[PDB]
Amino acid sequence: DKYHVCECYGHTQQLPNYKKLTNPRTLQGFYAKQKVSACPCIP
Amino acid sequence: LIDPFGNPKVRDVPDLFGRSRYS
Amino acid sequence: REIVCVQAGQCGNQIGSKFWEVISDEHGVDPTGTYQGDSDLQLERINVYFDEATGGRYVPRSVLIDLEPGTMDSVRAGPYGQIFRPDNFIFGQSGAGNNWAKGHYTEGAELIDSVLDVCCKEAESCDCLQGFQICHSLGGGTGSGMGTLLISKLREQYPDRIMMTFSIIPSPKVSDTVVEPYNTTLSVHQLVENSDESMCIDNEALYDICFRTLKLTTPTFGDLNHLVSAVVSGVTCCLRFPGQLNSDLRKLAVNLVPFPRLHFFMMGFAPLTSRGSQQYRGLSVPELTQQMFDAKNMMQAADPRHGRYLTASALFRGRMSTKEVDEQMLNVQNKNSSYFIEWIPNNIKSSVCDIPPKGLKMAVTFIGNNTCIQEMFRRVGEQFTLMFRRKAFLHWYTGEGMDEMEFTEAESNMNDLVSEYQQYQDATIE
Amino acid sequence: REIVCVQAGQCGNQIGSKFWEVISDEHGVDPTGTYQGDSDLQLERINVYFDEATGGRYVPRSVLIDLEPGTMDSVRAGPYGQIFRPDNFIFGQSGAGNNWAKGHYTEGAELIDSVLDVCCKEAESCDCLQGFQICHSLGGGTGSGMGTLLISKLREQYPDRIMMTFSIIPSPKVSDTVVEPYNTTLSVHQLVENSDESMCIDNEALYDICFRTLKLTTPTFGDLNHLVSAVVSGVTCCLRFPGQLNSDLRKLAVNLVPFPRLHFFMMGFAPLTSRGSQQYRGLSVPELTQQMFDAKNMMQAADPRHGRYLTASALFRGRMSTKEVDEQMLNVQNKNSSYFIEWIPNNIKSSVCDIPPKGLKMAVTFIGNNTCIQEMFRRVGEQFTLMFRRKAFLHWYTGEGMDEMEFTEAESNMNDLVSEYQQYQDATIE
Amino acid sequence: TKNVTVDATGEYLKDNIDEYPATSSECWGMFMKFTDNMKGKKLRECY
Amino acid sequence: DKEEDTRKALEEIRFHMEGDFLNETETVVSELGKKVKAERYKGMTEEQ
Amino acid sequence: REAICIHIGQAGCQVGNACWELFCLEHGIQPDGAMPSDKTIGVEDDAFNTFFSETGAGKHVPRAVFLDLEPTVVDEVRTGTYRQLFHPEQLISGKEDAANNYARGHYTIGKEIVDLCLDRIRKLADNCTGLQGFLVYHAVGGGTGSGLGALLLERLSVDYGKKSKLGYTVYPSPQVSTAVVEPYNSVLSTHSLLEHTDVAAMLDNEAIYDLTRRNLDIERPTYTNLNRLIGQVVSSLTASLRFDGALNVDLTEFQTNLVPYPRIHFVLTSYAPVISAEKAYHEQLSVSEISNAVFEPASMMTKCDPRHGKYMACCLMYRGDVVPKDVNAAVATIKTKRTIQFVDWSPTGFKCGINYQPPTVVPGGDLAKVQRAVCMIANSTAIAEVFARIDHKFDLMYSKRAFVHWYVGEGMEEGEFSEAREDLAALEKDYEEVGAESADMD
Amino acid sequence: REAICIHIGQAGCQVGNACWELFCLEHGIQPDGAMPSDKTIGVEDDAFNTFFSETGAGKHVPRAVFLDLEPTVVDEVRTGTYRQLFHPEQLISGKEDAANNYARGHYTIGKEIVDLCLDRIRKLADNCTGLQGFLVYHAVGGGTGSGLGALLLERLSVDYGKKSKLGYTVYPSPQVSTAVVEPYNSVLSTHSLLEHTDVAAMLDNEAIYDLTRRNLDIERPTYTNLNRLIGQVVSSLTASLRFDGALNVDLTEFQTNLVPYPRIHFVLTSYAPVISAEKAYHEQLSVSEISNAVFEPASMMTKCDPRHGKYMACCLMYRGDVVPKDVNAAVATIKTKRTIQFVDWSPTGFKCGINYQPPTVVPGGDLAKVQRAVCMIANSTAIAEVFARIDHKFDLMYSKRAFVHWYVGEGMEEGEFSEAREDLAALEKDYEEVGAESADMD
Numbered sequence A: 001d002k003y004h005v006c007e008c009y010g011h012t013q014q015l016p017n018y019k020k021l022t023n024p025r026t027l028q029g030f031y032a033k034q035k036v037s038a039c040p041c042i043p
Numbered sequence B: 001l002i003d004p005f006g007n008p009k010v011r012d013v014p015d016l017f018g019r020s021r022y023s
Numbered sequence C, D: 001r002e003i004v005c006v007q008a009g010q011c012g013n014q015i016g017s018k019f020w021e022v023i024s025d026e027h028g029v030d031p032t033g034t035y036q037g038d039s040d041l042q043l044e045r046i047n048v049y050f051d052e053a054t055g056g057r058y059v060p061r062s063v064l065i066d067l068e069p070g071t072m073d074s075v076r077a078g079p080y081g082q083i084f085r086p087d088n089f090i091f092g093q094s095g096a097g098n099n100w101a102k103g104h105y106t107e108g109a110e111l112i113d114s115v116l117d118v119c120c121k122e123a124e125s126c127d128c129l130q131g132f133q134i135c136h137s138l139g140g141g142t143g144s145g146m147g148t149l150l151i152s153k154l155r156e157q158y159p160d161r162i163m164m165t166f167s168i169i170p171s172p173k174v175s176d177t178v179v180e181p182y183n184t185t186l187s188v189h190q191l192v193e194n195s196d197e198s199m200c201i202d203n204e205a206l207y208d209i210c211f212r213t214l215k216l217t218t219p220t221f222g223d224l225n226h227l228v229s230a231v232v233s234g235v236t237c238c239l240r241f242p243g244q245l246n247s248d249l250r251k252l253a254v255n256l257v258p259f260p261r262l263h264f265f266m267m268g269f270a271p272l273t274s275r276g277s278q279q280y281r282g283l284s285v286p287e288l289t290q291q292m293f294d295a296k297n298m299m300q301a302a303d304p305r306h307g308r309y310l311t312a313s314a315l316f317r318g319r320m321s322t323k324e325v326d327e328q329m330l331n332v333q334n335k336n337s338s339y340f341i342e343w344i345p346n347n348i349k350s351s352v353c354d355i356p357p358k359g360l361k362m363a364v365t366f367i368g369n370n371t372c373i374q375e376m377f378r379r380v381g382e383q384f385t386l387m388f389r390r391k392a393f394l395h396w397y398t399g400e401g402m403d404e405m406e407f408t409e410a411e412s413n414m415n416d417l418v419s420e421y422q423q424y425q426d427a428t429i430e
Numbered sequence E: 001t002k003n004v005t006v007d008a009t010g011e012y013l014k015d016n017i018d019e020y021p022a023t024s025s026e027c028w029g030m031f032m033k034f035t036d037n038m039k040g041k042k043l044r045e046c047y
Numbered sequence F: 001d002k003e004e005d006t007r008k009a010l011e012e013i014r015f016h017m018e019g020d021f022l023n024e025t026e027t028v029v030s031e032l033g034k035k036v037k038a039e040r041y042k043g044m045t046e047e048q
Numbered sequence G, H: 001r002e003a004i005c006i007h008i009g010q011a012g013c014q015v016g017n018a019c020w021e022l023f024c025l026e027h028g029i030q031p032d033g034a035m036p037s038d039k040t041i042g043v044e045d046d047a048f049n050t051f052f053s054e055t056g057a058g059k060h061v062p063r064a065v066f067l068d069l070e071p072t073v074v075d076e077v078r079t080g081t082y083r084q085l086f087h088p089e090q091l092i093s094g095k096e097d098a099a100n101n102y103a104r105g106h107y108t109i110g111k112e113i114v115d116l117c118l119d120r121i122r123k124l125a126d127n128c129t130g131l132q133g134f135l136v137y138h139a140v141g142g143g144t145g146s147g148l149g150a151l152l153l154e155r156l157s158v159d160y161g162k163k164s165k166l167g168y169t170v171y172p173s174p175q176v177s178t179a180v181v182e183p184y185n186s187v188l189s190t191h192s193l194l195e196h197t198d199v200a201a202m203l204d205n206e207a208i209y210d211l212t213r214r215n216l217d218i219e220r221p222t223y224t225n226l227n228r229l230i231g232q233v234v235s236s237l238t239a240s241l242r243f244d245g246a247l248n249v250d251l252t253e254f255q256t257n258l259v260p261y262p263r264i265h266f267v268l269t270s271y272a273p274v275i276s277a278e279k280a281y282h283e284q285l286s287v288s289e290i291s292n293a294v295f296e297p298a299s300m301m302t303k304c305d306p307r308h309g310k311y312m313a314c315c316l317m318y319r320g321d322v323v324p325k326d327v328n329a330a331v332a333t334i335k336t337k338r339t340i341q342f343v344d345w346s347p348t349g350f351k352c353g354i355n356y357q358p359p360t361v362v363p364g365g366d367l368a369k370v371q372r373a374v375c376m377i378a379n380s381t382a383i384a385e386v387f388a389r390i391d392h393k394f395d396l397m398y399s400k401r402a403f404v405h406w407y408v409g410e411g412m413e414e415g416e417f418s419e420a421r422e423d424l425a426a427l428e429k430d431y432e433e434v435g436a437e438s439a440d441m442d
């Protein structure tokens, strides 16, 4: 319309996908399947 | 205090101005 | 012949409190609910409005409905509030928001089942059921939406009984609510199909009654609701006391309504007179008849002088002669003949009851079916079309879920009601 | 005509304490066991529930069984606990662990012989034995497993008598334990084969009764057990007092069960009303009948409006006319004809007893056989299917020794019970 | 500034308790308290 | 007969109003019951 | 029944001190949270519940949070006279300010403090049973008020969703000014108010200074006077929930009656019997006089002249000794006036409220004691003139990239200035189009 | 009825001092073992029996052993104030430590001391008539706690068989650390904890330090504070055996309800009313408030966030003035939240317990006095993140063979490092698989 859809400013009102976000992170499950190297180390 | 028919009536609106809650 | 009452919203609960005070006073019921009367004539028809509880007590057959219990706590706290049965108070947890769509669709459907269960439980206990009586405003939110919802459900469950409503409508000069035209139009659309008889009162007319006739220095809603409770208790008097010519709600409907859509009426009560003047004029049938037809004594803003009477009814209370009633109604019809619809040979029905309200020697209540009611509907329809053409506040109603087609249907049906009144206004014998 | 009571588990022993308080009060037995009554009507049927020991004393015909002695300490601490015979308390030294297989197979077979010995000792003392009465929960561990084991053994030893159970079943909304569905499913499989008549109670219905009708500020399990003890003591009243139309447990069974698997019933007790409201309503047979059929007064989560009545029974206590009872049952059958199975010409049995419960002028207990009870079992089957597809906690039961085929067999039996009720619900004359 | 403005009248209120106005709010009664006590106790509804 | 039924109904109401079930109190208490309050616990007293 | 108050930054905390002082004196809670229960004439009532919760030992504690990035002002609240009233967790303070940068509050620093605030608001909302809105106090001229106000409002919208949020906001005055960078912060707050707020009331200190000089007799007013006036207005609007009356009005009725379209939610506020003690005993103060007073621009708390626009809706709250017949006569007389005009699509322009509780008098206060008062909030197209002057000042500075280095270095894209300025320009065009008469009908 | 406590090494003995001070003060036994001779309460209740036995002379003595390889800590217990409470045989001490080597404890040094421990446990188990489990306190970061704890659990598991063994274990924090070789000891420990424990509760000192800084107002906490909190948790779990209540819970009901599969036995623990005396007067502490508290991750005593996993079962223990209807209303409120998720195969997720005895207050303690408390133990897939951190640290340090020569010298094959690391990798995959939705029926 004549306004902006709030995807500007970097905000979104879409509710989170709880089932996807709820699964844990594991070395083989999550980290080893990344193009850029990732690790469980705290920075 | 008079009813619309002429009879006396009791108060219907509280008297609060000039009153204090705690003695 | 017993009536079940329903009181909805703030206005309905407030008017109901004064009505049940007036009814309890005439039958000698103490504010504790104990009978303390002094004649068997009081007891012999107590069943019409009260059920009997053990060891003397009487309880009133009424349902109280509201969306926040604040009003319910105010009515329970009133001087006669104790008489009401605690289980008869039905309330929700969130308000109508002064919005018709909320009251009809969201909180209405949430509470309506408990109200229908209570109304059926009260109705099926009666040995013979007479009509229901409902008090509500059309300009509000829960009153209009849930009142019309409940009226529709009761009309489905009891289509052979009578449905009677007393209703408050917005004044032509000052609004109490901005969205009044939508709520009024949708409520009138529901009532014209569902209702059997509808009476209308303007708060502006009660203010003009108090200031011009009674010269009250500081009127309050208790006075307006007392005048309304007086007329409300007067209409049913012939149902519950003896008389030379008994009358009933169905007989009033049969004599007042010529065609089923023309069921909106004006109301008046006659022996209104200031305490200073009262010493100067005794009560007599000519005095009651003259005040009864004076437009100053009518409870709507429309004036009879711009219309014509199709039918009228007068209910008299007191020990009185049949000559004064018959000859006065003939004399008034003959002298003002231009104001009466000519294709009906006699427009007035009379009824006489022996027992007057306490402290008055005589009284009459007047019910009138007049075409000047078309002016109120025309004014509401104009304000509705100005607001609807510009989508003035529609997003609230559409967000609740209403289709826009409801607004155009209700406008078309009300416009046809105005056209039908105008057509009967200009009819001729030919 | 003597009844033997069995109380199993914590819920059963606690409900039993209140049951024996109500029965001891009605016959005027002091908590020491001494008779202190004031009418022969109390003494002439005392044998039905009490045996007389020498020098005045009376002892109650009940067996208490549990796997941890904690409950014995709870019943001993109650106001009437002393009345129970010491030899009638059977207990072990370790709990059921909320596990059906442990309660049925390991400690069950260890203790069951001593319980059967006590029940036989109590049964063979009667001159003529009427049915047994058992109280237990289906969601627990020793209640479900040992209760159903004992029910099966008593059904082997006395197949021509009546077997009656009062049973508590897990709420779909509130639970104290995670493994309720397995124990419930296995228990329902045992009951449908062994029982003659089974009543089902939801704790959710008792909480809703307490909060809405009685408006108790802080209800406790003692209140729920008081409502249950009231109905339990009410069903047997016609066995032990005079009346105009006597009735018996066997006549109730003969009139309620059309086919042997359809023996699951609904419960109700009519005079329930808050202390504030009691001043507002006189007692009468229409008021009791109206509360008796209101689903708000029924002790299960399923509502009759979702099913149809095959049969119903009402037992009235008090001095009243038979005409009012018969005409009320005719009016209810005629007005709601769609909710009654049409291939049975009259579904309601009535019974009248002269002696009311202490402090009440009149009372009625209602038993109903309605197909909507299938909805409770379906919900339990849903939760079972969610856990069973993933073998969620099966290793405990398999470690006790159960084969996994047992779970599928029990599920199949419950599914067939639901199917049979659904088929009789939708049957037609053709 | 906050001292001389607000703390002074706070101390005056501490010394004198007759400055609190009386009122009437009868709309808070037993049904409101019943709704208050019954939070989270919804049972036996059909959907 | 009417007067007798009225008297019985008043006695009925008086029994319900003064009872211990609706008033949520207990009067018949055993000595062991003063220590063990398994079911009948409802809350603490004012002194506590 | 209950309402939760959110106070942000310096203006919001200082206005909060006056508000909670008034609410304590109106309900009768002593400064330490106790109550002299033994010295009483009437009876104890539940009315406090809208603003207080009890611990059970009888201490009262209020439903509010105080949010600031500098410690000093909250430490002043912690060490003052009402030290024992507030729970210490409710007073939240960070380490360093947003330095008049909206970017510093929104992106870098407020993101660290925001999660504690949201956890406290959740702990309040869990101890409620009929919450019907949030009241927010902030100024859009400063950095933390604008930036953290915007972030908190955005998070609240997703978490609580449809629940209402009503804001009282101190906007930059049209010629009195306190800081140079006010236009950037006020513009970049446009999205938050436009998309995440249900009604926003705008106040300017220059108007309250004019009202305190002309009506009251104060030659040297200070912020405590303005905050006492704001507290009186909030007490008048919230009295309808807390005390008995002839025509009650729930907070949802304001939203239903005042906003015709979802963006047109900015309202002007005014208060009638602002009068000194020496003048108050020389004059009657009838309903018609105070009704005539609320429409004069000398009575308003925002620097705008409504004669340059058209009214869409008015909501009038009367409290004290008033009779409905006099309110109707007054409103009919106002309706008769020729200098008051309503848009032709809004025929029923008024909502009325009547409450019996008269306004409270505060011991150190400057208002006189009066038996009746009226307060009005109204939606009018004249407000479009207020935005245009800020847009002109923003256009002046952004042209030369006068101070953009601070915002871009602290984390903001230069595009956000053009985005915010075009969105407020579209809001001005919306206010121009909605107010145009439908003279073309056939 | 009875439970036997086994305390190993420094952390286990120091936590034992706090536990036995609390259990003595809760029952009323004086530090010298004799109850007050003039304290005639009226009925000598049996509640002490869970933790004390009488010596026939009327003294009470506790059902515990203290195990250490260095003398200092046990000699400190022998010379302190509670010298007369313990039987001297119960305090067992060796000559020299396991020097942070799991290999030294398991193979070289613990093998000499283990038979005395078994003789003491035999003498305790013979003085029981309803023993229903062992409670074990140890840290897996040190040499003797890991090595001798594993060896002793193996021997107990062969000798006693089905009897339950419940462990309270101090695990290494993600970032705070005390010794370099912690990763090797914690990997080698986990195989034994996996095979020889029925429920294992995991603790991290960094979480209890955060809890003591945030909730209590202590700037410089020490181990005595953490040990008093652990003692409170153990007292809450064992209260169900010792005092009257509405719904009792025996330890086998705990094991039956909390463990879904025999390997899935690692649980998180939290405690609600950790509060200071000054905070206690600003807030009521109702059942629903403390129930809401146990689910916030700020309340946990292990450094894991449960929002990153799914709950399978929760066991809630309430002690004090609570009514079952309030517990049901609280649990019904928790179920509505969307940030709390249960695996779809676990529909009835809660177990409840209700006991009437309120928590005891210790004179020198830092907790306030409160009328009610709730303690929660829960099983969740979020623990896979905990194991992933230890695995990563072991991988780096082993890849180099940074310290292996110590372990090989003290008796261990280098292969044992690889075996334990693969067994932990399989447990980590089990926690990944159990949380996978059942999309097989599509």
Ligand SMILES: Nc1nc2c(ncn2[C@@H]2O[C@H](COP(=O)(O)OP(=O)(O)OP(=O)(O)O)[C@@H](O)[C@H]2O)c(=O)[nH]1
Pocket (backbone or CB within 6 Å): G008, G009, G010, G011, G012, G014, G015, G069, G070, G097, G098, G099, G100, G101, G139, G141, G142, G143, G144, G145, G146, G170, G172, G178, G205, G223, G226, G227
């Ligand atoms: N009415 C009123 N206005 C105030 C008050 N305090 C500040 N203001 C005004 O609000 C604006 C300043 O905003 P502040 O609240 O100081 O900004 P802030 O929230 O502290 O932001 P930072 O400076 O980054 O910490 C100016 O226009 C002030 O005139 C007050 O107590 N009352």
Ligand SMILES: Nc1nc2c(ncn2[C@@H]2O[C@H](COP(=O)(O)OP(=O)(O)OP(=O)(O)O)[C@@H](O)[C@H]2O)c(=O)[nH]1
Pocket (backbone or CB within 6 Å): H008, H009, H010, H011, H012, H014, H015, H069, H070, H097, H098, H099, H100, H101, H139, H141, H142, H143, H144, H145, H146, H170, H172, H178, H205, H223, H226, H227
């Ligand atoms: N909470 C707590 N943690 C402790 C305590 N004592 C030690 N720890 C922690 O446990 C780990 C050290 O384990 P220790 O108990 O010292 O090892 P050990 O049992 O003495 O083994 P050896 O050194 O071979 O004698 C470190 O992470 C310490 O922070 C204590 O009293 N309380």
Ligand SMILES: Nc1nc2c(ncn2[C@@H]2O[C@H](COP(=O)(O)OP(=O)(O)O)[C@@H](O)[C@H]2O)c(=O)[nH]1
Pocket (backbone or CB within 6 Å): C008, C009, C010, C011, C012, C014, C015, C096, C098, C137, C139, C140, C141, C142, C143, C144, C168, C176, C203, C221, C224, C225
């Ligand atoms: N006569 C009369 N009118 C009333 C009374 N109370 C409210 N009204 C009118 O009813 C309308 C407001 O409707 P209301 O009852 O508030 O609607 P609700 O919000 O749905 O309950 C206005 O026109 C009021 O003037 C009363 O006691 N008497």
Ligand SMILES: Nc1nc2c(ncn2[C@@H]2O[C@H](COP(=O)(O)OP(=O)(O)O)[C@@H](O)[C@H]2O)c(=O)[nH]1
Pocket (backbone or CB within 6 Å): D008, D009, D010, D011, D012, D014, D015, D096, D098, D137, D139, D140, D141, D142, D143, D144, D168, D175, D176, D177, D203, D221, D222, D224, D225
């Ligand atoms: N109505 C009622 N329910 C109870 C009572 N005691 C326990 N329950 C319920 O029964 C279930 C516990 O079962 P329980 O009797 O302990 O099983 P058992 O261990 O095998 O005896 C839970 O849902 C309790 O809430 C009681 O006295 N009355």
Ligand SMILES: [Mg+2]
Pocket (backbone or CB within 6 Å): G009, G010, G070, G097, G142
């Ligand atoms: Mg600042």
Ligand SMILES: [Mg+2]
Pocket (backbone or CB within 6 Å): H009, H010, H070, H097, H142, H144
């Ligand atoms: Mg050591």
Ligand SMILES: [Zn+2]
Pocket (backbone or CB within 6 Å): A003, A004, A005, A006, A007, A008
């Ligand atoms: Zn955009």
Ligand SMILES: [Zn+2]
Pocket (backbone or CB within 6 Å): A006, A011, G191, G195, G196
């Ligand atoms: Zn946005």
Ligand SMILES: [Zn+2]
Pocket (backbone or CB within 6 Å): A039, A040, A041, H392
């Ligand atoms: Zn790494």
